[PDB]
Amino acid sequence: SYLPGYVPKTSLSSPPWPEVVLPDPVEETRHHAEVVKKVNEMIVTGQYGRLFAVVHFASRQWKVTSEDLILIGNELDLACGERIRLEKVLLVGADNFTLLGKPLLGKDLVRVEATVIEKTESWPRIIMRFRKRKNFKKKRIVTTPQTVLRINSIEIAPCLL
Amino acid sequence: FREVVETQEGKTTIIEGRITATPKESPNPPNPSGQCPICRWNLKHKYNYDDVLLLSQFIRPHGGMLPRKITGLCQEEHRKIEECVKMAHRAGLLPNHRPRLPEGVVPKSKPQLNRYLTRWAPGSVKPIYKKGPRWNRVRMPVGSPLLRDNVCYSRTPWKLYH
Amino acid sequence: VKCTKARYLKKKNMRTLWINRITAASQEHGLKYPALIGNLVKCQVELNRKVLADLAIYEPKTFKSLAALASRRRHEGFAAALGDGKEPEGIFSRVVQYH
Amino acid sequence: FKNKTVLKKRCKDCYLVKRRGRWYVYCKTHPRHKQRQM
Amino acid sequence: AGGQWRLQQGLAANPSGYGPLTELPDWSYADGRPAPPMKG
Amino acid sequence: GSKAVTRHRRVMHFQRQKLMAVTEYIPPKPAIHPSCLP
Amino acid sequence: SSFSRAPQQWATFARIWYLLDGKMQPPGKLAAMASIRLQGLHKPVYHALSDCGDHVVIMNTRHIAFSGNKWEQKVYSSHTGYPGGFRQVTAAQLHLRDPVAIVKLAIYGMLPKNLHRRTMMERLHLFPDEYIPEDILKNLVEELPQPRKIPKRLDEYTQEEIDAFPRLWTPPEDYRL
Amino acid sequence: HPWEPGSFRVGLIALKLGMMPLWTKDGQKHVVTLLQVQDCHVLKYTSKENCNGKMATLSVGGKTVSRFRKATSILEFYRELGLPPKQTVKIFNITDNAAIKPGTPLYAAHFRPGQYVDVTAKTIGKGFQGVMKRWGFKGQPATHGQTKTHRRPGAVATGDIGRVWPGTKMPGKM
Amino acid sequence: TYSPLPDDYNCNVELALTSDGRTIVCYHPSVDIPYEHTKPIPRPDHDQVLKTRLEEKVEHLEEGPMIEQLSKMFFTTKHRWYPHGRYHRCRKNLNPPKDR
RNA sequence: CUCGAUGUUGGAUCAGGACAUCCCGAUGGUGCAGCCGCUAUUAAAGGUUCGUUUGUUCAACGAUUAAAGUCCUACGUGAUCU
Numbered sequence A: 001s002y003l004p005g006y007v008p009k010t011s012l013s014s015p016p017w018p019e020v021v022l023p024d025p026v027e028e029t030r031h032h033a034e035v036v037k038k039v040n041e042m043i044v045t046g047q048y049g050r051l052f053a054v055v056h057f058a059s060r061q062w063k064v065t066s067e068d069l070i071l072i073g074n075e076l077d078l079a080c081g082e083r084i085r086l087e088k089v090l091l092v093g094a095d096n097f098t099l100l101g102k103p104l105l106g107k108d109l110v111r112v113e114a115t116v117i118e119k120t121e122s123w124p125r126i127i128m129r130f131r132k133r134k135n136f137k138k139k140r141i142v143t144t145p146q147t148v149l150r151i152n153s154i155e156i157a158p159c160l161l
Numbered sequence B: 001f002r003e004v005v006e007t008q009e010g011k012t013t014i015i016e017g018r019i020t021a022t023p024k025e026s027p028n029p030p031n032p033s034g035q036c037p038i039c040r041w042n043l044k045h046k047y048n049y050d051d052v053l054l055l056s057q058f059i060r061p062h063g064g065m066l067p068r069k070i071t072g073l074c075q076e077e078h079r080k081i082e083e084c085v086k087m088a089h090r091a092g093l094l095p096n097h098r099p100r101l102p103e104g105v106v107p108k109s110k111p112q113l114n115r116y117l118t119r120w121a122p123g124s125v126k127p128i129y130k131k132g133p134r135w136n137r138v139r140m141p142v143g144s145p146l147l148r149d150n151v152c153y154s155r156t157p158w159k160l161y162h
Numbered sequence C: 001v002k003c004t005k006a007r008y009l010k011k012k013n014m015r016t017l018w019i020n021r022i023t024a025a026s027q028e029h030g031l032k033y034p035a036l037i038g039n040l041v042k043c044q045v046e047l048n049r050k051v052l053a054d055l056a057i058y059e060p061k062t063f064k065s066l067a068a069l070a071s072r073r074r075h076e077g078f079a080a081a082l083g084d085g086k087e088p089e090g091i092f093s094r095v096v097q098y099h
Numbered sequence D: 001f002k003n004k005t006v007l008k009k010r011c012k013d014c015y016l017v018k019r020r021g022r023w024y025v026y027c028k029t030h031p032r033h034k035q036r037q038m
Numbered sequence E: 001a002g003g004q005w006r007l008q009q010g011l012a013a014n015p016s017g018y019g020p021l022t023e024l025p026d027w028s029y030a031d032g033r034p035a036p037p038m039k040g
Numbered sequence F: 001g002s003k004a005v006t007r008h009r010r011v012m013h014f015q016r017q018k019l020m021a022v023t024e025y026i027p028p029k030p031a032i033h034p035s036c037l038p
Numbered sequence G: 001s002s003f004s005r006a007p008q009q010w011a012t013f014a015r016i017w018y019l020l021d022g023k024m025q026p027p028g029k030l031a032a033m034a035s036i037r038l039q040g041l042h043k044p045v046y047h048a049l050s051d052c053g054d055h056v057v058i059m060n061t062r063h064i065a066f067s068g069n070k071w072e073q074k075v076y077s078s079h080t081g082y083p084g085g086f087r088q089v090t091a092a093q094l095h096l097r098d099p100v101a102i103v104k105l106a107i108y109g110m111l112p113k114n115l116h117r118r119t120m121m122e123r124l125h126l127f128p129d130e131y132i133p134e135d136i137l138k139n140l141v142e143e144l145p146q147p148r149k150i151p152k153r154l155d156e157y158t159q160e161e162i163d164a165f166p167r168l169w170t171p172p173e174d175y176r177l
Numbered sequence H: 001h002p003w004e005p006g007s008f009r010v011g012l013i014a015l016k017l018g019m020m021p022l023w024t025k026d027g028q029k030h031v032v033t034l035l036q037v038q039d040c041h042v043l044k045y046t047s048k049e050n051c052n053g054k055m056a057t058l059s060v061g062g063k064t065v066s067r068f069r070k071a072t073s074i075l076e077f078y079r080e081l082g083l084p085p086k087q088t089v090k091i092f093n094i095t096d097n098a099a100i101k102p103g104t105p106l107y108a109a110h111f112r113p114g115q116y117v118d119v120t121a122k123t124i125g126k127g128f129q130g131v132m133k134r135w136g137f138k139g140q141p142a143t144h145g146q147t148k149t150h151r152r153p154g155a156v157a158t159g160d161i162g163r164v165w166p167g168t169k170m171p172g173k174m
Numbered sequence I: 001t002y003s004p005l006p007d008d009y010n011c012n013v014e015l016a017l018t019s020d021g022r023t024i025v026c027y028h029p030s031v032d033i034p035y036e037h038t039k040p041i042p043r044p045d046h047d048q049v050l051k052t053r054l055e056e057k058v059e060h061l062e063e064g065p066m067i068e069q070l071s072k073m074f075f076t077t078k079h080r081w082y083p084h085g086r087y088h089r090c091r092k093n094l095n096p097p098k099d100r
Numbered sequence J: 001c002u003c004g005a006u007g008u009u010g011g012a013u014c015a016g017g018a019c020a021u022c023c024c025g026a027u028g029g030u031g032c033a034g035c036c037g038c039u040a041u042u043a044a045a046g047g048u049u050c051g052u053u054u055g056u057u058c059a060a061c062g063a064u065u066a067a068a069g070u071c072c073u074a075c076g077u078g079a080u081c082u
């Protein structure tokens, strides 16, 4: 009752981690469709409160929700009060569900809108250089353009199939 | 196995020997081509000092090792088990294989220090009073280099020097 | 001069902080930091460490799902590595191709 | 006991034994053969 | 992290490289009109 | 500095040390130890 | 969570009390676990200046186990400051003198070398045996898993386990053993 | 209780009257110090459990002093004891079998001739003293040109360490 | 029966992919604490002739003893309890900014 | 390194340290009978003299001693002295 590769049980006969058995792909494909349908129905029936989203904007990622403010570190060529859509949404989350892009969510699924509320400049930033014993000293002050955005709304549509 | 019994009756002593029950190797080893008990059961590189179920098969009732000619082990495996048994004794994993004490001997109370993976005998090691620089540090050996080829399930190899 | 040079350290220390916080959050779910970050990338989830640290603090249910996803992708990797090519690709291991 | 870097048995009655973590040469016939590993 | 893996899928080692995450427009006008192309 | 030939073993440049470390002989290892086979 | 602001803040920054059992455990692994908790590095809200460390209670510190020959080789050195005040003691000698010193020193050396360290040490509660004061026992929240799995002695194996392990060789019937 | 091996009994507090010669039958002269027990009473008993140490302790006091010069807390302590306040109180480590009820008087005959005792007291106060009187340093010569250096410590350390070791013998209160 | 993480502490995680495979859906409802896993709240905490008055037991402690008491009560070192000088006290911002 | 100065022999005073130990302790060997020695292992807690000539460190000599150790400390120490 011993197979060719049988090893008696010792501390090193088998690996320390437990054995993992993943679900049958055919059975899991059906379970996945059920989960997606359940979450889609929650969207149709409006069973969610406040939403948040992770949006890629101006090279960096922002976790935002309705009424939030974000300080963009450059000018955007938009008048104050102009409303725009943030098109790069990596994630949208609710109390009971979260949708993840691969890497970006489809534009049909989620719509994030924002409004320019201020265009200003940063406070003065000192740039000082110094090297001892070399009569080497310089001083430069820079102010960087900035734009303040208000996140107006995060809306999701029942487009999960 | 064989027992030797001395029975002294009056002025006459009688030394005899009897054959007791002998254990047999389990049937159908997974690797019949194997040349010693270890590789016949695909156990090479897959046992440690705490595998007393394995180690206890190759030792005498009082904790001593059995000859390699009797067990059939190869030199390499025989040496690994020998070191593993020493570590098992020192770790306290063989409480029923203690040395024989002559009648009237009761060891004095000695301080109990839990230890494992003990390469050397405690009394033969000196304190490391001078550790030395980082580039010539005196290290504290842990485990045995004989087990360096044991199967490693981690990405880090066994550290034998602490 | 200190104010000028500190701008480098601010960025460095902020990322160290995010890694520490992500490490803590991952350990609460039995995952080491490298396993989470690495396997999330293999799922084409490009969430950066700043957001991941924010999610751990303020959206713990989303973070547990991300930890579960990384763990699932990690187990699929092991199954694939153990296989000899007979097995099809894992459900979460499939990569969306762009052109 | 003379300290030695290389231990050598000097007669047939010399025997090598490892005690207290180092090798020794002991000889009952000629005690002058006793050596300690240095 | 993940640089070697991305290369194995024919992607840039750095996710800031080529691909939709970087090249696609960041925003558009709320009414639909597309935004002017980004300077980068 | 020291000459190319010295009485002691001269310390190597770190890059050369790494070169030596990476080019060490590696013996052929058999799948099954030959002593474990008939 | 819809809590009020002050209760919400209180909950997030609360001090948790942890229990750790040192029996048969190497002091270093115990210290590695305690150091993280005492600093707060197990919390996603961690920050150096948040003072968010927790309490760690370690019992059975008298029953720690060093690997190798550290009992004989590891030396703890101190200096009274007076001429001739240099003192060096082995781990074994220190352990019999102070049954909490080894674990305490291992933790002290792992904590950050700053002015917060001694404050963190105030949150560490070392007990050489199973006895823990009643007050300390009442505040405990969670016991941490022992880092080292204690190997079973040969006398602790059940006959089922012994029977499951095969006999590997046949001794000669005429061997005295 | 009866005396048992390993038992430690209480001691006394006495006043040092002076010194006196006595002679032994072999002709040898031994000077002795007279110690008078003046109003010695047991004051407090602390059990082994509460002492913070390995043994029980018994507090003894000696010599009556004015109540008009003692702190209120001390006066109320002595009020409950029913004794006048004592100048000095000392703590004696004792075994449990040697406990004595607070308020018991103690007498010189507690000790017997032939016994050996240890006597602890504050040494005579000599104030701030130089190294010669305090530590028995040799000082320096009186002539052959010494400049304002006769009773001084000399060198206090080596040049290398650039500091003075803790415990270094120096002038101070003796 | 496979679950990537235990489902018993924070939420019940269910992971799924859309049919196209471009979106990961995560359903994570909260797990409520079971009633069986709770304790009951400890609500439970002489013909006197004289009205019982409040008695002040707040005996003033000296700095040393006071600091020892505070340090033990809050598991801190003594240092935090000592005062600071005017220079530092007057540098502190008494109207600091407040985010939310 | 120091010359907009890091005071240069021996001694006095006080000594900190190493052990490759002069004495005292514990051991192995001996061409170790004993008494004395020689050699090696271990040991740095404690100790290690006073004099005549010489500026001397040294050296010689007188008388002792259980022994009159070898060295480092800016050839320890002059904001302490000479």
Ligand code: FES
Pocket: B034, B035, B036, B038, B039, B040, B044, B073, B074, B077, F035, F036, F037
């Ligand atoms: S012959 Fe195979 S392990 Fe010994």
Ligand SMILES: [K+]
Pocket: J002, J003
């Ligand atoms: K000069």
Ligand SMILES: [K+]
Pocket: J054
């Ligand atoms: K002269």
Ligand SMILES: [Mg+2]
Pocket: none
């Ligand atoms: Mg970086």
Ligand SMILES: [Mg+2]
Pocket: F001, F002, F003, F004
């Ligand atoms: Mg050259």
Ligand SMILES: [Mg+2]
Pocket: H124, H125, H126, H127
């Ligand atoms: Mg006086």
Ligand SMILES: [Mg+2]
Pocket: H138, H139, H140, H141
């Ligand atoms: Mg004089």
Ligand SMILES: [Mg+2]
Pocket: H147
């Ligand atoms: Mg003058």
Ligand SMILES: [Mg+2]
Pocket: H146, H147, H148, H149, H150
């Ligand atoms: Mg004068």
Ligand SMILES: [Mg+2]
Pocket: none
């Ligand atoms: Mg100058």
Ligand SMILES: [Mg+2]
Pocket: J015
């Ligand atoms: Mg000295």
Ligand SMILES: [Mg+2]
Pocket: none
């Ligand atoms: Mg020596």
Ligand SMILES: [Mg+2]
Pocket: none
């Ligand atoms: Mg000099």
Ligand SMILES: [Mg+2]
Pocket: none
């Ligand atoms: Mg000077």
Ligand SMILES: [Zn+2]
Pocket: D009, D010, D011, D012, D013, D014, D026, D027, D029, D030, D033
């Ligand atoms: Zn011989």
